[PDB]
Design an enzyme around this catalytic site. Structure first.
Site, mmCIF file in Angstrom:
data_model
loop_
_atom_site.group_PDB
_atom_site.id
_atom_site.type_symbol
_atom_site.label_atom_id
_atom_site.label_comp_id
_atom_site.label_asym_id
_atom_site.label_seq_id
_atom_site.Cartn_x
_atom_site.Cartn_y
_atom_site.Cartn_z
ATOM 1 N N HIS A 39 -33.635 -24.018 27.923
ATOM 2 C CA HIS A 39 -34.579 -24.722 27.050
ATOM 3 C C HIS A 39 -34.313 -24.270 25.637
ATOM 4 O O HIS A 39 -33.551 -23.332 25.415
ATOM 5 C CB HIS A 39 -36.058 -24.484 27.425
ATOM 6 N N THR A 86 -40.836 -15.329 25.857
ATOM 7 C CA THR A 86 -41.458 -15.560 24.515
ATOM 8 C C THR A 86 -42.627 -16.556 24.663
ATOM 9 O O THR A 86 -43.297 -16.886 23.679
ATOM 10 C CB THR A 86 -40.438 -16.077 23.504
ATOM 11 N N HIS A 101 -44.570 -27.933 26.432
ATOM 12 C CA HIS A 101 -44.271 -26.822 25.498
ATOM 13 C C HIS A 101 -42.840 -26.954 24.936
ATOM 14 O O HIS A 101 -42.601 -26.706 23.723
ATOM 15 C CB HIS A 101 -44.493 -25.481 26.217
ATOM 16 N N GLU A 135 -36.658 -18.128 17.366
ATOM 17 C CA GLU A 135 -37.636 -17.029 17.744
ATOM 18 C C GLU A 135 -37.081 -15.676 17.261
ATOM 19 O O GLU A 135 -37.732 -14.999 16.422
ATOM 20 C CB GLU A 135 -37.775 -17.054 19.232
ATOM 21 N N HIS A 170 -36.231 -23.671 21.545
ATOM 22 C CA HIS A 170 -37.347 -23.525 20.604
ATOM 23 C C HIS A 170 -36.883 -24.059 19.239
ATOM 24 O O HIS A 170 -35.726 -23.729 18.877
ATOM 25 C CB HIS A 170 -37.802 -22.087 20.469
ATOM 26 N N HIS A 227 -32.193 -20.860 24.901
ATOM 27 C CA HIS A 227 -32.414 -19.779 25.881
ATOM 28 C C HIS A 227 -31.893 -20.236 27.213
ATOM 29 O O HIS A 227 -32.466 -21.188 27.832
ATOM 30 C CB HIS A 227 -33.926 -19.528 26.021
HETATM 31 C C1 LIG Z 1 -38.300 -18.154 31.969
HETATM 32 C C2 LIG Z 1 -38.665 -18.593 30.562
HETATM 33 C C3 LIG Z 1 -39.401 -19.747 30.367
HETATM 34 C C4 LIG Z 1 -39.726 -20.146 29.101
HETATM 35 C C5 LIG Z 1 -40.570 -21.371 28.891
HETATM 36 N N1 LIG Z 1 -39.337 -19.390 28.024
HETATM 37 O O1 LIG Z 1 -39.690 -19.759 26.784
HETATM 38 C C6 LIG Z 1 -38.530 -18.294 28.212
HETATM 39 S S1 LIG Z 1 -37.952 -17.388 26.833
HETATM 40 C C7 LIG Z 1 -38.211 -17.886 29.487
HETATM 41 ZN ZN LIG Z 2 -37.613 -19.446 25.523
#
Ligand SMILES: Cc1cc(C)n(O)c(=S)c1
Ligand SMILES: [Zn+2]
EC number: 4.2.1.1
Length: 257
Positions: free
Chosen positions: A91, A195, A61, A103, A93, A116
């Site tokens: 991570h 998200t 993802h 986002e 987006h 994030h």
């Molecule tokens: C803990 C967590 C994990 C993911 C993949 N995402 O996208 C968020 S915003 C928070």
């Molecule tokens: Zn995220």
């Protein structure tokens, strides 16, 4: 299983994860004119001096940069938070094109990507218990715009060819997340959710006003990652963002005038 395509994308998620249509979903559009200054907010305290990165993982993802969270080493506190939240992973987006990928949006403006930094409330003992609570997480969200390179990002970009496909991981020690932070810690804050599925409503969102700049070459390398696993038809990892969700009965507060 869930993803970001036509048949398993965000408009589908509610069928396995009904909280997708819940009362405090994320992301949202930040209407800067409607977000009220709250002079009771505190400066954010970001204490990342002792952060211990361990590994980087392509999870099909996005990619996660993972931290040793078995002691108070990299913590977020202050701002809207009560108590201490421990960094577990970060991570991003991002989009297929520079005009989309974030986002959260700011007056409907989309940035090229969004970082994030995920932290869990230490009063709950670990991340798994924290995501069962309405104040279990604090996510620091930072926008990326394409312009000048971010030097502090380059070690991440340079490892991505080693985790091209779903399920690949690589040693990723001694990475300092302070090099991903903009100058100002001015922010917006509101109660929301993860998200991505399972979309849990555990998150105090803290979204920095100031974006970081990354180069076109750095974001291009994110777009060469793959959602598929090794030996599967190539599907580039792009557009792994959920669009803005209804604000419902929530107020976004600003830390700044
Ligand atoms: C803990 C967590 C994990 C993911 C993949 N995402 O996208 C968020 S915003 C928070
Ligand atoms: Zn995220």
């Amino acid at each position: 299983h869930w993803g970001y395509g036509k048949h398993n994308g965000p408009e589908h998620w509610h069928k396995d994860f009904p909280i997708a249509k819940g009362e405090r979903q994320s992301p949202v559009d930040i209407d800067t004119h409607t977000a009220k200054y709250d002079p009771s907010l505190k400066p954010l305290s970001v204490s990342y001096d002792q952060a211990t990165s361990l590994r980087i993982l392509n999870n099909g993802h996005a990619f996660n940069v993972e931290f040793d969270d078995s002691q108070d080493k990299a913590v977020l506190k202050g701002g809207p938070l009560d108590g201490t939240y421990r960094l577990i992973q970060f991570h991003f987006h991002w989009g297929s094109l520079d005009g989309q990928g974030s986002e959260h949006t700011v007056d409907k403006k989309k940035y090229a990507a969004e970082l994030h930094l995920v932290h869990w409330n230490t009063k709950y003992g670990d991340f798994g218990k924290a995501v069962q609570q309405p104040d279990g997480l604090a996510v620091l969200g930072i926008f990326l715009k394409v312009g000048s390179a971010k030097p502090g990002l380059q070690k991440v970009v340079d490892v991505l060819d080693s985790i091209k496909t779903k399920g690949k991981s690589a040693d990723f020690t001694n990475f300092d997340p302070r090099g991903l932070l903009p100058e100002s810690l001015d922010y917006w804050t509101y109660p929301g959710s993860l998200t991505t599925p399972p979309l849990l409503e555990c998150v105090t969102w803290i979204v920095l006003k100031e974006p970081i700049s990354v180069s076109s070459e750095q974001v291009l390398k994110f777009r060469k990652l793959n959602f598929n696993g090794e030996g599967e038809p190539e599907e580039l990892m792009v557009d792994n963002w959920r669009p803005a969700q209804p604000l419902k009965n929530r107020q976004i507060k600003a830390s700044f005038k």
